[PDB]
């Protein structure tokens, strides 16, 4: 049974005591606001051993910007651990997975193959997708004036994700970018009908996080700072 969202992050989901069944969340904000820092915070919580405050559940990470900094992750894990050593961090990393996707078609091919991963790793109960909006500009040109043609591949990936999230009760933390102009939707409808919570990031170092929950149309606000130890919720 997947752990409830209120356990993954008590400082964001303080009213989600029920076990999760295929929820989806999204991050949105300008550059250098902390979207990738949060994914390190959540990733650290889920791979650390239970003796050190973690949950001990594997994680899968999908990258399409090539911005994943291995050193920045490891420096966090050594800090958080009470007594960090090389032979300890090895096991902490042993529950982390990574893939790179170069184009929407490559991503779609990867998704159809990821069906085999979860059939072999039942503990894999988290899924992260960085910069879902990487191929927007390229694809919007190859599709011509016909909107249906512009979004064809992005729609298929959306239909694939929803199928994976429910067959195995995962949590998807997608990430997007502020490319046009608070909020300005540009992705397809086949995807925007899936997101439950949409969270926004701002800059002033103090970072302010605003959460909107379309499940109940409730708005909140949080604060946090980024230090050498990672994210700290005020």
């Amino acid at each position: 049974g997947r752990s409830s969202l209120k356990e993954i992050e008590p400082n964001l989901f303080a009213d989600e005591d029920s076990p999760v069944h295929g929820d989806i969340l999204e991050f949105h904000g300008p550059e250098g606001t902390g979207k990738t820092e949060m994914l390190y915070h959540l990733t650290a919580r889920c791979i650390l051993p239970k003796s050190e405050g973690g949950l001990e559940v594997e994680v899968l990470f999908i990258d399409t910007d090539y911005h994943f900094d291995m050193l920045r992750l490891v420096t966090i894990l050594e800090h958080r651990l009470s007594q960090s050593s090389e032979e300890i961090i090895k096991y902490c990393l042993g529950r982390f997975f990574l893939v790179y996707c170069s184009s929407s078609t490559h991503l779609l091919l990867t998704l159809y193959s990821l069906e085999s991963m979860f059939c072999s790793h039942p503990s894999l109960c988290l899924l992260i997708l960085d910069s879902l909006s990487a191929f927007y500009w390229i694809d919007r040109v190859n599709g011509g004036e016909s909107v249906n043609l512009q979004e064809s591949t992005l729609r298929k990936c959306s239909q694939c994700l929803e199928k994976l999230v429910n067959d195995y009760r995962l949590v998807l933390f997608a990430t997007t970018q502020t490319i046009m102009q608070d909020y300005r939707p540009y992705l397809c409808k086949a995807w925007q009908q899936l997101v439950k919570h949409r969270m926004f990031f701002s800059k002033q170092n103090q970072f302010s996080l605003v959460s909107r929950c379309l499940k109940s149309n409730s708005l909140k606000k949080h604060f946090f700072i980024i230090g050498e130890s990672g994210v700290e919720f005020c």
Partner: protein, 313 residues
């Protein structure tokens, strides 16, 4: 390495049809004959032939160092100003000369048109000049004074070299021959200047001996009304990469004269010149400030204009 069709210069409409049929990388289209590729997609045989042509179709620092020495610098008869520039106005690079009107930019432009024709055996470059005049300041009779004066100066050295080959290059160097290699171009509006700049890469390929291109006036004296929309697409893109590439493939020097700047036209303009000089007054005495350069630190010098032409103080 799976080149992607968005990186190729294929026409936008044809690319849409190609991708819709399922083609993603250029490596797929290499084997298919043009006859079949015209049927799988809704394009004509001519397009099928043009497309497959695009799909299929250097020097180290040591080598560039050798070429840099050999390619002579253009002198200005001002040993002071020529000293800060490193020897003279260089080839394969763009230069700019800013300054308020009435300071002598056109005099320096004219003096360079003559100094590019000096024979090589005196340390010159032996090239012809192109003078794209936008302000209509060209005065041929002035070149005569700058020309005959230079020959007299050139004559005063050959007598000390005695029987060297200078006595033949001096015969080759004459007033009529000098004036028979200065090409004029009168532009009266932005459209004419754009048209001329578009055709210049052709005019230069026909005359391999040209070694200096001058653009007397990058900003028209009366940019007004709707013309301001025409100025864009010339300072943008046009006069930043057309002049650099033209001045490099043909191995020549380009000089742009500017009038707006007057102190020590678009924010991105400042990056459009490899070198930039500024002329201004001080106590009613001319100055030649160097403001930007990737090989010479900022410095200032003095100069004066005499009937004999550009000269030191």
């Amino acid at each position: 390495m799976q080149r992607d069709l968005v990186s190729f210069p294929l026409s936008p409409a044809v690319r849409v049809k190609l991708v819709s049929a399922g083609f993603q990388t250029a490596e797929e289209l290499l084997e298919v004959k043009p006859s079949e590729l015209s049927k799988e997609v809704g394009i004509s045989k001519a397009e099928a032939l043009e497309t497959l042509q695009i799909i299929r179709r250097k020097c180290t620092a040591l080598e560039l160092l050798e070429q840099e020495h050999t390619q002579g610098f253009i002198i200005t008869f001002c040993s002071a100003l020529d000293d800060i520039l490193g020897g003279g106005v260089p080839l394969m690079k763009t230069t700019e000369i800013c300054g308020a009107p009435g300071v002598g930019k056109t005099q320096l432009c004219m003096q360079l048109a003559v100094d590019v024709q000096i024979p090589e055996c005196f340390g010159g470059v032996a090239g012809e000049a192109v003078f794209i005049d936008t302000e209509g300041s060209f005065m041929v009779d002035r070149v005569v004074d700058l020309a005959t004066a230079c020959i007299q100066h050139l004559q005063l050295i050959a007598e000390k070299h005695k029987g060297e080959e200078h006595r033949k290059a001096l015969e080759d160097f004459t007033l009529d021959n000098i004036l028979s290699h200065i090409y004029y171009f009168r532009c009266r509006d932005y459209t004419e200047l754009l048209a001329q700049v578009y055709l210049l890469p052709d005019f230069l390929s026909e005359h391999s001996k040209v070694r200096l291109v001058i653009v007397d006036g990058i900003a028209f004296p009366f940019r007004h009304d709707l013309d301001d929309l025409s100025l864009r697409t010339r300072l943008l893109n046009g006069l930043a990469q057309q002049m650099i590439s033209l001045a490099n493939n043909h191995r020549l020097a380009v000089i742009l004269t500017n009038q707006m700047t007057t102190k020590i036209l678009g924010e991105s303009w400042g990056h459009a010149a490899t070198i930039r000089l500024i002329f201004h007054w001080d106590r009613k005495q001319r100055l030649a400030t160097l403001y930007k350069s990737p090989s010479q630190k900022e410095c200032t010098v003095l100069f004066q204009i005499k009937p004999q032409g550009f000269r030191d103080t």
